[PDB]
Amino acid sequence: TEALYQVGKEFTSKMDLEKPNYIVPDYMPVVYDKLPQPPSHREAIVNSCVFVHQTLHQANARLAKRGGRTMAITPRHYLDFINHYANLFHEKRSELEEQQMHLNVGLRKIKETVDQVEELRRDLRIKSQELEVKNAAANDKLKEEYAVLISEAQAIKADLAAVEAKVNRSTALLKSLSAERERWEKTSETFKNQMSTIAGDCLLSAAFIAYAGYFDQQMRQNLFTTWSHHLQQANIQFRTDIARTEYLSNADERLRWQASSLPADDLCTENAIMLKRFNRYPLIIDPSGQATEFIMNEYKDRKITRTSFLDDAFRKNLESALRFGNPLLVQDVESYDPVLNPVLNREVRRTGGRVLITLGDQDIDLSPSFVIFLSTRDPTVEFPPDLCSRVTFVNFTVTRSSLQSQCLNEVLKAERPDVDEKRSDLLKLQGEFQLRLRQLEKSLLQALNEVKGRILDDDTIITTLENLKREAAEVTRKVEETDIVMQEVETVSQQYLPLSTACSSIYFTMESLKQIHFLYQYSLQFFLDIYHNVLYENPNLKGVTDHTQRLSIITKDLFQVAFNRVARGMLHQDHITFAMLLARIKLKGTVGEPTYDAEFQHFLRGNEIVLSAGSTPRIQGLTVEQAEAVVRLSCLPAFKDLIAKVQADEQFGIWLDSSSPEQTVPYLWSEETPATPIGQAIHRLLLIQAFRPDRLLAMAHMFVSTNLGESFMSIMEQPLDLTHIVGTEVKPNTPVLMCSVPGYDASGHVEDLAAEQNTQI
């Protein structure tokens, strides 16, 4: 902690972190034991910088204790952090001061313009007086030289006409510039507030770039909230309104990122910012592969080359990229070649006017435009701590919101192609429209910031402002009309929202199946193939034309195909577990059903309700374990009168020792309103677990039958139809994995399958 503080304080000396008005809080979140008792604002900032680094150690411990994969936290992360803090602070301070410079110039030109028309109106009145004097004098003299006098008066009349027209046009310009003058005044007042939060805002932003890349959406948010909370206890000022993506990137850059096929997702946008503001070279983790495409789209103009650590030309490609300064993308970083160790550590030797990098035993001149990106498609790969210290982790993990958007768009494309196309055109139109407005406000600001003397003196400046204002109003008119048409798109898309929620829940259930068996590995493409099958290769939609009925078919068939394809690659003992979860996902989709969260809370865990010796009595007709299950189940309001109901039922003994008690579970639960068939099954499920745990699987199958139908699990009972799956469902690039338990071997099935198809193998 002492080393971190000294590095932070020494490295932030160039920083302008002096706030004489800073108030020391009564409870100071001190992490450096020798931090001075009345800390200064700079002392608090460096103390907060130390705290952020130590939070990642706590963060890694929490994921490690839960079995999650963690990457080493090294001092190079801290050096990365403070480096970004210095750069962002200077960048944000420079941008704000530069912006405040234009606003002050723009405001003063408008104020001068208001003065100019005031004297020009005074001049207009003066010129009118001159006309009255000249006309009266000419008339009196008339009542050859007088012809010149009236010609002089007529010439002044043209001058007055030019003056009065200039007054009206400049007044209309001033009225047209009233909104811009008001907007610039408001921001100029807020200059002090923004200056007062840059120190805190950049600290949070820099920490996010240096540490948050490897973690998923939930863990990134937890880290930012922990840092934000600490700044509050330290009285460090930071704004809580602007999102981190908006504060670390402009709209122009985000527009180009979309053109480079970057997914429209906040975490993906955060990754793009990391891929732009990195200090250590980025290591990209993208199982889906859009990040690899995005990097290649972003760097075509700079001639980026894709290569791999396993390719034979990697050393030549690396040498060429270093020598010519071209971007290089290297894949398969799980096979990392330690030849990059000097490159990643930036171990350059500058002697004799030459910048040299030692690659193996050969010295190479390093061009300053060189950049290297490392990528892997395996999210589960472990890197050694030495590699973790040399790279910036940028993890592309699927978020629930992004998958919901992807699935909502895909069903819209399949089901409402006219609506989906209209949505796509509007987003392109609105993207261009917002782009144009930004240029319009920038150009209009530049015109007032580059004009000398007065605006009225040069009629060209006046015309340009009117044209920029005229185009600004029309585009603003075009934005309003695109807003209402999106409302037509949004209200159509609301019908397909529950399906997209089901899609994300199903995939994230599939993604969690690796926790119960190492074999249950499922990519996002596997689920997208399932989703595509339900939307485009569904025999139940052949003649259906009603959109609502098609949606019900799609929703039903999505659950069925998801179970069919996943369970063929699961052990049969785990089939009920996956079907149980799909039923719970489908139950959440039913608006008319209750949550049953308490009943499922009791169905799981359950044993955590500790019972004392006096808490559990001796119910005649039940064993000790059965009696305890009664007492624990008694905690629900529905089963509060559980012991009495069993005692009042002498026939309960017969049902307790029946072969199939799950099919005749007595109505032994109390309730106010009549329960639902799904609700009755859940009550029977709790009763069976309490009294006949050997029939819990049988009751679970009935629960799945109640939610998903009687034939939902029937495919697993049939022999595998390898012919249909290989011919239609399996892509040629996708290997077919024949996984068998000991004593079983699927080689013969493939050999027979080739014979049936009369194909060679």
Can you spell out the DSSP letters for 325-392?
A: T-EEEEE-GGG--GGGHHHHTT-EEEETTEEEEEETTEEEEPPTT-EEEEEES-TT----HHHHHHEE
CA angle 212, 216, 220 (to 5 degrees): 40
Structure tokens at 707: 């939610």
Nearest to residue 54, comparing CAs of 11, 8, 21, 15?
Answer: 8
Strand partners, 358: 363
Backbone angles phi, psi at 389, to 5 degrees: -75, -20
Strands 371-376 and 362-365: unpaired
Residue 241, amino acid: D
Long-range contacts of 481-484 (CB under 8 A, 24+ apart): 482/426, 482/429, 482/430, 482/433
Distance CA 80, CA 280 (A): 7
Annotate 25-93 with three-state secondary structure: CCCCCCCCCCCCCCCCHHHHHHHHHHHHHHHHHHHHHHHHHCCCCCCCCCHHHHHHHHHHHHHHHHHHH
Nearest to residue 213, comparing CAs of 305, 137, 276, 151?
Answer: 276
Burial class (CB in 10 A: 0-12, 13-18, 19+), 36: exposed
Cβ atoms 695, 663 nearer than 8 A: no
Cβ atoms 282, 373 nearer than 8 A: yes
Cβ atoms 210, 88 nearer than 8 A: no
Residue 348, amino acid: V
Contacts of 127 (CB under 8 A, 6+ apart): 156, 159, 160, 163
Residues in the chain: 761
Distance CA 62, CA 68 (A): 8
For helices 191-211 and 266-277, angle between their N-to-C axes, nearest 10 degrees: 90
Sign of the torsion angle spanned by Cα atoms 439, 440, 441, 442: positive
Count CB-CB contacts under 10 A for residue 30. 17
Question: Rg of the chain's alpha carbons, rounded to an integer?
Answer: 36
Sign of the torsion angle spanned by Cα atoms 422, 423, 424, 426: positive
Q: Tell me the three state secondary structure of residue 393.
A: strand
Residue with tokens 């580059």: 450
Nearest to residue 48, comparing CAs of 66, 68, 32?
Answer: 32
Distance CA 205, CA 83 (A): 12
Nearest to residue 536, comparing CAs of 511, 553, 519, 513?
Answer: 553
Distance CA 35, CA 40 (A): 10
Using the CB atoms, write b or e for 308-318: b if 16+ within 10 Å: bbeeeebeebb
Q: Which helix (H) or strand (E) holds 281?
A: strand 281-285
Nearest to residue 520, comparing CAs of 585, 571, 563?
Answer: 571
Cβ atoms 527, 509 nearer than 8 A: no
Structure tokens at 8: 């932070």
CA angle 574, 576, 581 (to 5 degrees): 100
Long-range contacts of 468-471 (CB under 8 A, 24+ apart): 468/440, 468/443, 468/444, 469/176, 469/177, 469/444, 471/436, 471/440
Backbone angles phi, psi at 241, to 5 degrees: -100, -50
Contacts of 311 (CB under 8 A, 6+ apart): 317
Q: How far is CA 358 from the centre of its chain?
A: 39
Structure tokens at 396: 């592309």
Query: DSSP for 489-533?
Result: HHHHHGGGHHHHHHHHHHHHHHHGGGGT-TT----HHHHHHHHHH
Structure tokens at 398: 């699927």
Cβ atoms 448, 174 nearer than 8 A: no
Contacts of 669 (CB under 8 A, 6+ apart): 638, 639, 642, 683, 687
Sign of the torsion angle spanned by Cα atoms 739, 741, 742, 746: negative
Structure tokens at 162: 């030019």
Cβ atoms 167, 128 nearer than 8 A: no
Cβ atoms 113, 174 nearer than 8 A: yes
- Rounded alpha-carbon distances, angstroms, from residue 461 to 113, 454, 474, 668: 12, 10, 20, 86
Distance CA 524, CA 399 (A): 11
Long-range contacts of 226-233 (CB under 8 A, 24+ apart): 226/55, 227/48, 227/51, 227/52, 227/55, 227/203, 228/204, 230/29, 230/48, 230/51, 230/52, 231/48, 231/200, 231/203, 231/204, 233/25, 233/27, 233/28, 233/29
Cβ atoms 359, 339 nearer than 8 A: yes
Count CB-CB contacts under 10 A for residue 355. 14
Long-range contacts of 666-673 (CB under 8 A, 24+ apart): 668/639, 668/642, 669/638, 669/639, 669/642, 670/637, 670/638, 670/639, 670/640, 670/641, 670/645, 671/638
Burial class (CB in 10 A: 0-12, 13-18, 19+), 534: buried
Distance CA 568, CA 570 (A): 6
Strand partners, 392: 282
Contacts of 288 (CB under 8 A, 6+ apart): 396, 398, 523, 524, 525
Distance CA 376, CA 253 (A): 25
Residue with tokens 């405001």: 107
Distance CA 53, CA 38 (A): 23
Nearest to residue 78, comparing CAs of 44, 110, 55?
Answer: 55
Query: DSSP for 681-694?
Result: HHHHHHHHHHH-GG
Q: Which helix (H) or strand (E) holds 305?
A: strand 305-308
Contacts of 227 (CB under 8 A, 6+ apart): 48, 51, 52, 55, 203, 204, 207
Contacts of 16 (CB under 8 A, 6+ apart): 89, 93
Contacts of 571 (CB under 8 A, 6+ apart): 517, 519
For helices 191-211 and 217-233, angle between their N-to-C axes, nearest 10 degrees: 130
Cβ atoms 470, 131 nearer than 8 A: no
Residue 663, amino acid: Q
Contacts of 460 (CB under 8 A, 6+ apart): none
For helices 145-176 and 75-142, angle between their N-to-C axes, nearest 10 degrees: 150
Nearest to residue 263, comparing CAs of 427, 430, 402, 374?
Answer: 402
Maximum distance among all alpha carbons in the chain? Answer: 138
Method: cryo-EM
Backbone angles phi, psi at 178, to 5 degrees: -65, -45
Annotate 184-252 with three-state secondary structure: HHHHHHCHHHHHHHHHHHHHHHHHHHHHHHHCCHHHHHHHHHHHHHHHHHCCCCCCCCCCHHHHCCCHH
Cβ atoms 251, 438 nearer than 8 A: yes
Strand partners, 394: 284
Distance CA 708, CA 702 (A): 10
Q: Tell me the three state secondary structure of residue 308.
A: strand
Contacts of 120 (CB under 8 A, 6+ apart): 163, 166, 167, 170, 456
Resolution (A): 2.6
Q: How far is CA 223 from the centre of its chain?
A: 15
Q: In the 8-state DSSP scheme, what is residue 539? A: G
Backbone angles phi, psi at 284, to 5 degrees: -100, 130
- Taking phi over 0 as left and psi of -120 to 50 as alpha, with beta for the rest, 596 belongs to left
For helices 251-259 and 266-277, angle between their N-to-C axes, nearest 10 degrees: 100
